[PDB]
Amino acid sequence: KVFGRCELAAAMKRHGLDNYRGYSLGNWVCAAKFESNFNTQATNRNTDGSTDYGILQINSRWWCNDGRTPGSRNLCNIPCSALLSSDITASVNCAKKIVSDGNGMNAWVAWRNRCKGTDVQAWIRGCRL
Ligand SMILES: [Cl-]
Ligand SMILES: [Cl-]
Ligand SMILES: [Cl-]
Ligand SMILES: [Cl-]
Ligand SMILES: [Cl-]
Ligand SMILES: [Cl-]
Ligand SMILES: [Cl-]
Ligand SMILES: [Cl-]
Ligand code: NA
């Protein structure tokens, strides 16, 4: 499922992500934009052999099980395929664990490089929320 911008903002808010660990909703929408272009089915292999999954490109090295990432963990206790659903519940719950891990949203390299310090409120501007 390819979300619209305001549609995804609303779904993220309904699942408790707005201001989670102090990160406003626009930060989360911005990260989703540049990780997946709002596509829940996005996957992207990494050089180390892990794979990133879903709207927030959650990585199999630490966070989900895909059966082909040697030496990895599954700290969200989910199959990585759950992160591709049209229902974003699994991605949101796992992102809450990731953003709590110590470095905040810097865990998402694209958030640091393309969202951090910018006018992230633009990503929710105009939305009925
Ligand atoms: Cl957009
Ligand atoms: Cl917010
Ligand atoms: Cl915002
Ligand atoms: Cl594995
Ligand atoms: Cl584990
Ligand atoms: Cl599994
Ligand atoms: Cl949803
Ligand atoms: Cl933080
Ligand atoms: Na894994």
Curated annotation (Swiss-Prot):
The keyword Nucleus does not apply. The keyword Secreted applies. InterPro entries: Glyco_hydro_22, Glyco_hydro_22_CS, Glyco_hydro_22_lys, Lysozyme-like_dom_sf. Its EC number is 3.2.1.17. The active site is at residues 35, 52. It catalyses: Hydrolysis of (1->4)-beta-linkages between N-acetylmuramic acid and N-acetyl-D-glucosamine residues in a peptidoglycan and between N-acetyl-D-glucosamine residues in chitodextrins. GO terms for molecular function: beta-N-acetylglucosaminidase activity; identical protein binding; lysozyme activity. Its main location: secreted. GO terms for biological process: cell wall macromolecule catabolic process; defense response to bacterium; defense response to Gram-negative bacterium; defense response to Gram-positive bacterium; killing of cells of another organism. Coiled coil: none annotated. Substrate binds at residue 101. GO terms for cellular component: cytoplasm; endoplasmic reticulum; extracellular space. It is an enzyme of class 3 (hydrolase). Disulfide bonds join 6-127, 30-115, 64-80, 76-94. PROSITE patterns: GLYCOSYL_HYDROL_F22_1, GLYCOSYL_HYDROL_F22_2. It is found in: Secreted. In the egg white and polymorphonuclear leukocytes. CDD domains: LYZ_C (cd16897). Keywords: Allergen, Antimicrobial, Bacteriolytic enzyme, Disulfide bond, Glycosidase, Hydrolase, Secreted, Signal. Residues 1-129 form the C-type lysozyme domain. Monomer. Lysozymes have primarily a bacteriolytic function; those in tissues and body fluids are associated with the monocyte-macrophage system and enhance the activity of immunoagents. Has bacteriolytic activity against M.luteus. Belongs to the glycosyl hydrolase 22 family. Lysozyme C is capable of both hydrolysis and transglycosylation; it also shows a slight esterase activity. It acts rapidly on both peptide-substituted and unsubstituted peptidoglycan, and slowly on chitin oligosaccharides. This is Lysozyme C. The lineage of its organism: Eukaryota, Metazoa, Chordata, Craniata, Vertebrata.
